[PDB]
C-alpha cells in the first residue's frame, strides 16, 4: 500500500529494470514476483522497476543495479522507499534519445542495434526522465526517456511505439 523504506544493496540480477527483495520482505509487502514497483530516491527522483525475490538478499535491503541507483541519485547503503505500482498502463508511444558523450562516432541504426533487443518481450516499466544504459554489439550507449504516453509512467509493451529520432542530448 504505502512506501516501505529499505537499504540499497548491489544487484545480483544485473538488469536496469529489476530490483530484488528477500521473500519474507516480499510477503510482508504483499508483492508478487514480476510486479511493477515505484521507487523513490533523492532529489525528488523516482524509478519504476520489476520486483523479484532473492534468497541472498537481507530482509531490510533492496538490490538494484548502478543504472537504477544513478536514476535515484543514491549510493549503496542509502535508504530508498518502495511501493506497489499496479496501475501503470501500457505505453502508446515513448520517445528516447541517446546521450551525446556515449554515442561519439557511433554509426548505424540505434533502434535495431540497441533499443529493439533491449525492450523485446520484456514489458519494461519506464519513467519520463530515466537514463538507461544499453549494450549493442560491444558498445554501451546511454539513452534518456524524453517523453512517454501516458506520462510519466508506462510499460513498454509489444505494441508500444518506440521513437528514437533527433540529435543526441547533453
Amino acid at each position: 500500500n504505502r512506501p516501505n523504506r529499505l537499504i540499497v544493496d548491489e544487484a545480483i540480477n544485473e538488469d536496469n529494470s529489476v530490483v530484488s527483495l528477500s521473500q519474507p520482505k516480499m510477503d510482508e509487502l504483499q508483492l508478487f514476483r514480476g510486479d511493477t514497483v515505484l521507487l523513490k530516491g533523492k532529489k525528488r527522483r523516482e524509478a519504476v522497476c520489476i520486483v523479484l525475490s532473492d534468497d541472498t538478499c537481507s530482509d531490510e535491503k533492496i538490490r538494484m543495479n548502478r543504472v537504477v541507483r544513478n536514476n535515484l541519485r543514491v549510493r549503496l547503503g542509502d535508504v530508498i522507499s518502495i511501493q506497489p505500482c499496479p496501475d501503470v498502463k501500457y505505453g502508446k508511444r515513448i520517445h528516447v534519445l541517446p546521450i551525446d558523450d556515449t554515442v561519439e562516432g557511433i554509426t548505424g541504426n540505434l533502434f535495431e542495434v540497441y533499443l529493439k533487443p533491449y525492450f523485446l518481450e520484456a514489458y519494461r516499466p519506464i519513467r519520463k526522465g530515466d537514463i538507461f544504459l544499453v549494450r549493442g554489439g560491444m558498445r554501451a550507449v546511454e539513452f534518456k526517456v524524453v517523453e512517454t504516453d501516458p506520462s510519466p509512467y508506462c510499460i513498454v509493451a509489444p505494441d508500444t511505439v518506440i521513437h528514437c529520432e533527433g540529435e543526441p542530448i547533453k
Binding site: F32, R33, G34, I50, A122, I155
Partner: peptide, 15 residues
C-alpha cells in the same frame, strides 16, 4: 492481461 505480462517478465528476467 496482467498475467501475460508477468509470464513474459519472469521468462525474460528470472529464467
Amino acid at each position: 492481461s496482467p498475467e501475460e505480462m508477468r509470464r513474459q517478465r519472469l521468462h525474460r528476467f528470472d529464467s
